[PDB]
Design a protein around this ligand. Sequence first.
Ligand code: NA
Lengths: 80, 559, 79, 75, 79
Amino acid sequence: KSLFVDSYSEILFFVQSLFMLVSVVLYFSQRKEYVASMVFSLAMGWTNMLYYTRGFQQMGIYAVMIEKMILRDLCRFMFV
Amino acid sequence: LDVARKTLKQFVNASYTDSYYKGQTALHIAIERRNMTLVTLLVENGADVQAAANGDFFKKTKGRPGFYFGELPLSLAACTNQLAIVKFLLQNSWQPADISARDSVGNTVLHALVEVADNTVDNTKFVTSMYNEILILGAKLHPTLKLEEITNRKGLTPLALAASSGKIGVLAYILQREIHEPECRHLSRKFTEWAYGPVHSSLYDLSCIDTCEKNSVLEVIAYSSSETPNRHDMLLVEPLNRLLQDKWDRFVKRIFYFNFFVYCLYMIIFTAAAYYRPVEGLPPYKLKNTVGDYFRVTGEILSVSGGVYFFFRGIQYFLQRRPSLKSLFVDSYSEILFFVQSLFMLVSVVLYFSQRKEYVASMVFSLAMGWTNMLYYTRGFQQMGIYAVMIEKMILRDLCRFMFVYLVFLFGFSTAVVTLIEDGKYNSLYSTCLELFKFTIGMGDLEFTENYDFKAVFIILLLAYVILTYILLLNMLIALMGETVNKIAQESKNIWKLQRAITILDTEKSFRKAFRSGKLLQVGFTPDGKDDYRWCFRVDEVNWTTWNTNVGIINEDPG
Amino acid sequence: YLVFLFGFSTAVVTLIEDGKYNSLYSTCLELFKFTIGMGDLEFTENYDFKAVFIILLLAYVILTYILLLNMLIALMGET
Amino acid sequence: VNKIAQESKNIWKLQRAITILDTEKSFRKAFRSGKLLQVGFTPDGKDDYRWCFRVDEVNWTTWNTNVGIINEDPG
Amino acid sequence: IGVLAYILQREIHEPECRHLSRKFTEWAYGPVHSSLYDLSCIDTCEKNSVLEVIAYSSSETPNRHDMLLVEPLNRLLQD
Ligand code: NA
């Protein structure tokens, strides 16, 4: 329960690594879908830079607010 | 008692030799513990009241621990809120304390009192009460001594020190000081010229406020560094705001309007000259024999002249104010912007005579900055000035944070998309970054290319980018701007007032007309019979509640 | 906003060498289109120094569309 | 945004605390403060040493400061 | 959180029991006094330190985001 309600950053970094490893597996299996897996890994890797805003007070609080907006407002809006 | 032996001195006056506590004596310890009887006992046996505690622990800040009080027992008693000990040390029959004594850094007891102030209610109450008591006692003991114009090693009076350090409570107390007792009313700075019914006219001493030849309070506050704790709030202290408004309305507003008009003319001429630039070959361009050609060359000469003028104004500012390389890029935004515009103009001139067509690029950058620099003149109007201050604050906080996060997201999704793309017109990072940025301005395509395998991946990437940036981050930016606007009204008004104060001081130094108020006789005379004339600012007040108005009016026959 | 629009329009039209957008009115209209969600960002190529053109357009966009309009919404909320 | 300022600051502080603990476990340098004698001694005569964090305070209101100070000669 | 705040700042001002306190005064001069905060079982315990317990607590813990504000812990983390 704290897995998917806490530990967001651990999950995000792990999922990025999973996309990378799936890309490796597809690449040596002669499949061109390795590119799709790799670009998903790349996009997640760039968005995971937001983890390091912690370490600076203003940017860190901004990132926390981004998380809260996603989890409350964007989610309700997206359902409707 | 049982150790003081007349076999007395050099033992009742022994002091620490340690570098940390160097100078501390038994009198210092007795005062610190608040023992009146012990202090009298030490004073009786010949303890020196001018002993200086020069140790590092008693230094201002060097070394994290320590308490600074002026190093002297009188200053120690003053800065610890011990009135009885101060009075005893000043008026003892054995060795009176020298009220005018200066510590190692030149600070007197008033300077030390200003130094221990920290802008808190109880601290302010105690510090100002002790300041008033010390002033009264000094006047009684030395009617001719001029306590508040003694400077420290840095050339600061207690008032100048307070203003330059942000001790706003002390500054407010000093500027409105009203001492309502005979034989010491000359120490006051606020006077009542007359009172009739509910309305009474007040006189505010202006000495060392707007002209001092060393450092006036206005100059000290206006040109203080950004680190000064209360720099934007100190101009709100009662007399200063009215004095600045008086200067504005009397002579500075017209000069500011003339400057704004001249800048508008300069920008119009620059725009016209740039608009009609020849497009024939390389510069320099031969002068045709036509009226339009002569007017264009005139416009170009005027534009270069304005660029030279602003370049030299920037150099002059850098030399006269000597920014500390931190207030350079944290303060002085407008000076930097005007200087950079002038630099673009001069680079354009250099390129133009070097036969390079990049002079046009430099010139258009100069032109765009010149037009956006018009926002400087919104100061001079309250509503537009506060609006410009809010624009600055939004840029510096909300837009900056948003842009960092947004550029990270844009670059990441652009690299993913361009990697997915196989070939074609969009297989470059620049083109795909531009396509994704178009989504931010309501122009995103969502089908700008088909040069890929796995259309599902392409659309998933684009939709994720859209949801994260357009739907989430931009709307969040609006909400955060709303929060900021809600929180910065008073700060923005105070910043605008400080900006106008800077303009007023700059005009007064680059415009004997700019002279505060009238020279008036306000306390009658000093302790000596001589009548004292002081430059005073008159402020009218009305009070329907405290009808008594028991005051030492200067002039009867009000008005 | 009108100060910013006029300034960036004069800069852009000065940078433009010739063609359909070498008039102040046309370029002012092109830049105003950004305010209503219709800005092109490639409405002309009649220049040297494409980098200067895009830098001017991006600066104008950031200052007006991203900053000033959203600030207007926030100030309206306060009012 | 209006309602979550304090919550967001506290969450950020907890996040940085997690980072600090993780670094201390994956980096004997990371040791809090000085070992000081602080109450003199236990009920038994033995002197007790405790690792203590020093915090400087200033109070202009309660001048009394009647305390059982450990060290004279402050500083 | 209330019990935690009380415990971490415990000052017992009586003889023969002052050893129970966790907050001490090392020295006081004029208006400034230096305080000593006991750190035993705070940042290293080998069983469960207060910092480890708070930082790695579950999301259901009532005051998990507020407990780091208790006086000594914030300064210790910043240090
Ligand atoms: Na649109």
